[PDB]
Amino acid sequence: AIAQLATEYVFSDFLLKEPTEPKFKGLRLELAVDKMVTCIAVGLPLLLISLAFAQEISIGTQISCFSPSSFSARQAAFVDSYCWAAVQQKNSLQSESGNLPLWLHKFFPYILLLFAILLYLPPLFWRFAAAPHICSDLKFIMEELDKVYNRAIKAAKSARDFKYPIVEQYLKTKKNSNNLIIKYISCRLLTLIIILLACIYLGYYFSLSSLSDEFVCSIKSGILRNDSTVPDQFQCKLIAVGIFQLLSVINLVVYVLLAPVVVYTLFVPFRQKTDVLKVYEILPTFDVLHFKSEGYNDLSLYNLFLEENISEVKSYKCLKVLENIKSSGQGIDPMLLLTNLGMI
Amino acid sequence: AIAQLATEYVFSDFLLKEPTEPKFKGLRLELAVDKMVTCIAVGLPLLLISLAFAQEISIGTQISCFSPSSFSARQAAFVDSYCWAAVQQKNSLQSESGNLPLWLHKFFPYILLLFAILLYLPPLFWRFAAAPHICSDLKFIMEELDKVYNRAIKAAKSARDFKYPIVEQYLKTKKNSNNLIIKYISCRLLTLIIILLACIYLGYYFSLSSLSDEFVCSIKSGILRNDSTVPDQFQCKLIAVGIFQLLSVINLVVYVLLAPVVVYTLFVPFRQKTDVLKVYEILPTFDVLHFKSEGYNDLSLYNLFLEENISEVKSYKCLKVLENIKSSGQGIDPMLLLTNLGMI
Amino acid sequence: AIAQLATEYVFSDFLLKEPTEPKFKGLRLELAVDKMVTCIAVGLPLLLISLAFAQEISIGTQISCFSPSSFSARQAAFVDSYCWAAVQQKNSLQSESGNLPLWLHKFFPYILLLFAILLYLPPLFWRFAAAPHICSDLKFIMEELDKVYNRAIKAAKSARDFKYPIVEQYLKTKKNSNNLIIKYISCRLLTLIIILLACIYLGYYFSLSSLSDEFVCSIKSGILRNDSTVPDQFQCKLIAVGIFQLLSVINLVVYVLLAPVVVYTLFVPFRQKTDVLKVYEILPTFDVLHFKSEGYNDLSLYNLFLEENISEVKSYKCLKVLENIKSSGQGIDPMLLLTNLGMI
Amino acid sequence: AIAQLATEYVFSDFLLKEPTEPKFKGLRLELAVDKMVTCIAVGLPLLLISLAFAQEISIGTQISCFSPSSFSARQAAFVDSYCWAAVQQKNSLQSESGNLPLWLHKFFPYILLLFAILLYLPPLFWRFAAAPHICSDLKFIMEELDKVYNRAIKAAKSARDFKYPIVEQYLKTKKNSNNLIIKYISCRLLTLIIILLACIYLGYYFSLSSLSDEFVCSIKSGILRNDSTVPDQFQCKLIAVGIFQLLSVINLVVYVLLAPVVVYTLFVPFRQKTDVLKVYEILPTFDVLHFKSEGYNDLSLYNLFLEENISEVKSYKCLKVLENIKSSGQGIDPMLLLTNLGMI
Amino acid sequence: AIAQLATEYVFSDFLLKEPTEPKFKGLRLELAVDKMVTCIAVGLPLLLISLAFAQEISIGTQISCFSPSSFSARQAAFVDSYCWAAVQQKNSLQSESGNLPLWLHKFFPYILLLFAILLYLPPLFWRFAAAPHICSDLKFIMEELDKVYNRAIKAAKSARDFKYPIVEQYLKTKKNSNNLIIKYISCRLLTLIIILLACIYLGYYFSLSSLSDEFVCSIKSGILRNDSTVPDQFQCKLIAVGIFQLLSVINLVVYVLLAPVVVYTLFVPFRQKTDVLKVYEILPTFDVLHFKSEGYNDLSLYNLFLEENISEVKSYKCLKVLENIKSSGQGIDPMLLLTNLGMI
């Protein structure tokens, strides 16, 4: 049913499942824009395939050949099945557009599934090769930030009654290596390349004459060759090709809307904005240094992932509360922090 | 079965699922009127699609063409499938109303599913882009309110035997920025625009002549062109078009009933009523200031979400009990609060 | 449906299920490259089998025989079923390519399933015969590493206020025996051999004339032998053989892309890189000795499995944080370790 | 679908389910070679049955009879069903090979299911009659070994700062009785006998003429006896008999590969190797005596089950670590044990 | 599918489900031989019913009637359905064997299901009427035995540093009443009676002429009586009657193998063996008296249930360890018990 496919592929959490494992607990490991690009680019061809053969849009078989009236029902079934299998054998069928449109019309679901798989591959490579590396580091950074917050408020609480910037040094180190960022821009670049190839294929397929689904087929190989009761050629038509073209144009539109999103995603430093650690600079136990910007290096990627997963950090939440209050400038940062009383 | 679709789409918790995650625990993050508008505007086209092809309302195929009596059963099947695929090819079919009604009749389920998806998109954008931002802030506000209540009753209990309005300052800050409110009114405005476009389309479709489902179809392209045994044209009829129109008028009625609800939702300040924090003004540890009204700013949105999710706050419940008792004015607020004894 | 098979075999965690048992908790026991090689080499033939008979690619029966017009529908069904069963009996059918292509065309799904099973067998033998042996040892090594880290920081903490390298001696012992490594390279070698045999078979099958699916069949054994109403021979065609060849070439391409991966996996010492225990050499309670390289011995296999599962080790994570910071060389290892304060 | 059966019967944990009960927690109670022999010998005939009627290998009905052209479709259906039911009634059908091949061709799935059930029976008898007896004893032995290890390290720890070999005496007692071992070799012997009978049957069935699936059938009992419009005899063919023979040869090959495994399993003392308790002899609280070898007695069976389930024993793991280190002979057993510090 | 039924009815835990309730936790309440007799006698007729209509053994309809060639397909369908419904109306059909074989052939699945239900009834009556009574008593006896063991080892431990035989008196009381034992032998006797009636019916049914499935049927009641186009009588055959007889002989064989098992089960005192409480006689806190044998009284039934469920009792396990060691006679019972140190 149409509504079942709708639920399964947009309303269900299709490709939105969090990693079912206690290693990454609440950690996203895939940027929201990347998760939605993957969800679209993968589920749309699948949702389109499932639509193209919805039981109410499909009239029946995928091909019909119009055997003569003298032919029996089984003889007609042979002609249909033969021509269906004969869209490959170029000698049997004669089509005005060519044999390539026939191949594309028969194997359109396979090609869409191929595009879905190829578009799922880069997110899978990211989830397996580079997601744990960033997950461990991000979990460690969040733990260290919570610890420095607790120590800062404990020092402030003792005042109301070591000191090494380890996380800052770790991020300074991340500023050097660029392995994770080249992995990220490589998976994004393969996603963009596959999306553009899919756009090219879908634009070509939609550009077909729309009469290329009608091909002349001749069951005259083998012992049927010199047979006389069988006519020389049959007029076959590939049903559901109009549906294929109408769905291919939808896929092409969505993909050419998605390609600018991927291209923008490709520029990872430009997206690093609203410096997340700047809110921590108001802590005594934390050095006054953001030092996170301007590079095609893993530091920018970590900045993005921190900007995403930082809302889970309670210390960040309270510090951002104080920072927003500081916009008015009524009281003072350490006083409001001591008032806070939120170690964990 | 009809009853299965009924269960799935009204009696089941379709699109009423709470976010399956411990980040938002009992927090709604979608106003009840917005949740019901989404549920209706999305499930109604899906429920209608599933109805339009219920096994007891569908007689069989979606098209029937009445081939001549001389035609074999397979030859008749070819005519049916050809004309079904030929509602697209404008050269083959001749219809009094035009080819556009034929397109709309064949692809009515697809268009309804498209409307369902487009109507689901703004709630999805709200759930992903702006729901966590409001969720963290609302959870922090509820925690701070419980904390101030506990501190107030502890001070009162010590009397029977810091002091910074942090949440008030946070809300004062929210009064300034308007990012969340423009996100909210933007998703609501896209919902209204898509609902109005769906109303326009459904009113047009229902306005079709009701004989536009009968079209004359000619299987005479290719080698069949100069064939003589095949008649010049066939009288095809698109079954289940009357069902499509009867369901389109239902969808249009429900949508023109839903559009005023969305328009009213669009006026977020007007809906901010029954000042929820006013009940907290009777606490000594809480400054005597509501300061939440009159603006197209995120403060009004936060007021709505607080009015919704505030029933989960135990301190709010007890304070509202005292406030309602105060209507009689028998005793006194601090005495009844000390009697209360409900820290958590 | 195509999309259902897509989900089940690429988007679902097919053959990615962690061992459902508390004996191995978070331990991989299968290298990521080996897990992906198994997933591909097993799920691809299964995904291809399921595709080759997707309800929208299949026109109907797998064989059609074109009985004469005088034959009844049941008589035609007998001819079809007889020839289907007669691709085996070499006396009945006469084919230009031979009877072997006919056998291969009828039993192509069985042969692909056979290849899937044979390719699943070596990973199963590894999971049952050699996975627990390495699992117990790896869990013990991780526990001992966490213990030595805790003891080192406790000694450092006492300074701020036994001693036997047991794990080093255990690994030195592993350096001697080679049972696990010969088991590993044997399962990998059988995987490579079966992949190459599958490549050979698929390249042969795809090389078939593409007209070998058309065979002449004669229902003239038994009492039908001297019967006259039945014609001498029927022109049968095996539908879905073009689909079989198009899928066999896909399987062959993926398999010849997979074979270099298996060959590279076969060289286990070469893959032992980024010495994982080198990060532990900065501990006083740990002897300054890596001693893990250069051999076709179980030590290299354990090095690979440690490199994989070591991210679960918290002590390793903190030590790698200190080691990366040491790249700048600002402070000192024991001071930063004492600052760390992460016993568990 | 083929791939569904593949998953269910090889890739799923079919007959690999651990006993769903807290009485045996992590205890195997079935030797790995016995578990795999059972899995193969049971799932292979089931997997073969499911294959023999895969929707893409089955052309349709299991029998086709070729009624005359004058016969109606229902009259043809009567002939087919009559002959299908008439492979039993020996008077009606005349076959060159005999009626026994016809019986075997009709009831091949039943015979394979019968073999699967009979092969599942001995493992079931072992799981119910003799598995709890060995489970309680093995759990007690593991608990006693952990206890003696704890006591030995506690005595060693007190030195760094009763005494009855109960488990040794228990095993000495097991050395006497042979009830469990005769139960084990009896279930293995019945498994071997049933496997050999299945090999004999499958080798016979595969040896059929391959034209025994074509039998002449005569619907001429009752009032049809002297009827004239009905022909004297019909040429029926049992479709899917070639598939049955091709699957029977596969089953026979796998079974004659499995029979040597069962025969080797039958020699339980020979398999008792790598004396597991020898690693415990380095404990002071444990007497220096293995005393486990050379007998057709329950002690050898317990030795096998201990060798299997001993990896779950933590004390055994640590002791084996020390024993492997002792191969180099650098330090000393009690010193390394005291260093160990792994009571539980 | 055959393999699905195989899994469901032998390989699944069909009728082996433990009582899903915390009242009986690990308590069997059904003797293993009784559980297996129930499983066989109930699942075998169900497994046989499911086999008799496996989609690959069923050719199609259950009856075929061979209407004349002039009859239309719908007219043939009327004859088939009429005769199917007319095996009851004795006036319409004329069969050589009689109308009773026809009744038995049509309703064979119903009769097998009836036998399955009647054979399930006595185990159900036992599970509901007499299982809780024995469950409470057995749980109390096990608790009292664990308590007396704990007290005995505590007295022995105090020596190394009340007294009423309550459970012995309870069992002495059980020796008097015979309600549970007459309930048990009554359910077993009804099981045996129903098994013997099923054997009689199946032996009769299998003894049918095997041509009793062919009956002459006449659709000539009502307005068809004096009609002329309809022939006087039709030759109908009940397909799948040979399958019914082949399955009935299997059921009869299994049932005549099962009946001796039930008869042996009927002799409950004879089965009371290996006196389970004899192992407790070596406790000082336990009187030296077995006092459990020789009677058609509830004590023998309790002895059987204790022999079954006693392996769950830890104290029994340790005491049996000491008793087996006592076979050698090396040490002494109280010394080894004090060494034991297993209170719970």
Ligand SMILES: *[C@@H]1O[C@H](CO)[C@@H](O)[C@H](O)[C@H]1NC(C)=O
């Ligand atoms: C069919 O007849 C034609 C007559 O020209 C001949 O060339 C051809 O070889 C024949 N083919 C077969 C299959 O007999």
Ligand SMILES: *[C@@H]1O[C@H](CO)[C@@H](O)[C@H](O)[C@H]1NC(C)=O
């Ligand atoms: C069919 O015959 C007509 C006769 O006017 C001719 O114009 C047309 O080209 C023919 N088409 C084919 C397919 O032969």
Ligand SMILES: *[C@@H]1O[C@H](CO)[C@@H](O)[C@H](O)[C@H]1NC(C)=O
């Ligand atoms: C069929 O007739 C031919 C005539 O030559 C004869 O050789 C053959 O034995 C006959 N077969 C049967 C089944 O009667």
Ligand SMILES: *[C@@H]1O[C@H](CO)[C@@H](O)[C@H](O)[C@H]1NC(C)=O
């Ligand atoms: C059929 O006719 C034959 C003629 O010989 C006769 O022997 C036989 O008894 C008849 N059977 C029936 C059913 O009338």
Ligand SMILES: *[C@@H]1O[C@H](CO)[C@@H](O)[C@H](O)[C@H]1NC(C)=O
């Ligand atoms: C059918 O015709 C016969 C002629 O003898 C007559 O006896 C009988 O009553 C008729 N039945 C009906 C239904 O008219």
